[PDB]
Subunit: 176 residues, 3 copies
């Protein structure tokens, strides 16, 4: 699991993946706000104070996900979490957003064993991510930035910036 958090069907992994399957299902079935938050704190690497993740929520590992304080994640979010996904404070994430830590080689022979490479995703403080957005590997979204609904983010986004479209392009500066 350490060749993987560093971006290369293991024993540890298949247990951790199977634990997450258990907890996800339990969370997505929980009708109780407190019990979900509780279960989620057992799924996630870290889930901050006054923070909230709406079900159904999907990921593979859980423990690679760290979520800060007063951040809200809306329903139906998918996170391919083979590499760390770090989300700061006061972050808003709209529904059906996708985080793809994983990806593969172009060459089909380099794919027959399902070799995944993973690069972490970082969402800094006070960021608003629109519904239906995709964020691919290695992306950092800088503090106080906005990603418009349905964008696909392939490159790092500077702080105090608005971005939209697909690929995402910088629409305007939110600097004072």
């Amino acid at each position: 699991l350490e060749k993987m958090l560093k971006g290369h069907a293991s024993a540890e992994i298949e247990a951790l993946r199977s634990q997450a399957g258990r907890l996800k299902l339990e969370i997505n079935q929980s009708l109780d706000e407190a019990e979900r938050y509780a279960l989620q704190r057992e799924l996630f690497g870290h889930l901050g104070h006054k923070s909230c993740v709406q079900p159904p929520f999907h990921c593979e590992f859980g423990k690679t996900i760290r979520i800060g304080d007063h951040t809200f994640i809306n329903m139906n979010v998918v996170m391919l979490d083979g590499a760390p996904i770090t989300i700061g404070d006061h972050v808003l994430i709209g529904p059906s957003t996708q985080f793809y830590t994983a990806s593969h080689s172009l060459d089909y022979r380099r794919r027959q064993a399902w070799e995944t490479i993973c690069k972490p995703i970082v969402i800094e403080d006070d960021v608003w991510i629109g519904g239906n957005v995709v964020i691919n590997q290695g992306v950092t979204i800088g503090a106080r930035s906005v990603v418009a609904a349905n964008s696909v983010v392939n490159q790092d986004v500077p702080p105090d910036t608005l971005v939209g479209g697909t690929p995402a392009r910088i629409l305007r500066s939110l600097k004072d």
Copy 2:
């Protein structure tokens, strides 16, 4: 809940949101067409005759959603329903479509309390909405119009019109 249906963690609201969590889960788990339709009529503001909503279906409040007659909504649809969402008769909605009544201010200080503003969405009669479409706040789609799969609709769409792309642009007139 009235400062909100008018587009500004309340008592009523947290009950209505918690009721919807209950019913959604029950609907999405129901293997019985009649019992789903029954449960859905208890979730929704209104669900018309010969109308059909395929599970899993996701929303927050339920009671702000009014669906007309002979309309079909395919599976995995998400509706952020803080403001009314009104859907007419003979409407077809493809799977994984998103309705976002909610949104936020650009300014990150105007977002720390998760203040949402909500504007209603209206889908008139005989409209066909493609799979994977996003419809943002305040949008009306006029009667007999078509929205192509994967479009993102930000502005009102006239009747008898075909629209596609992202942002949606008017592709051709379906007027006789």
Copy 3:
């Protein structure tokens, strides 16, 4: 059901659709890798050896879906399977991908009875499909091709080819 696999509320159909509702729910609730694979082999037309479909997975009929060997389908995939969907060997499909076998007529009068037309989708061997992709009717993706995350594929994609954007356009040749 034969006017339909050939691309036009029946008895057979409503049973087969209702069986799939049963099995889907059972699969998406299964915490056991072996039991899912088992249940999935009962849902699908064919599910090959060393092949893997991650829950939750959504479709309508199940029996029209044939999946080859060593292919991996990630979570939250939706398949409108009124016409055959044929997926080869060593295929990778990213999460939240959509296959739309179904579609409708532009004309709203040609839609009041929810008449669907269906055209099959074929994904050949060694193809990698990115997360969040839409594939519409009648599309074949040729062997060893790559479809970048979030593309919408409307036309056939030649083998040894990389495609991306929406509509998908051919980005580069993966021929040796």
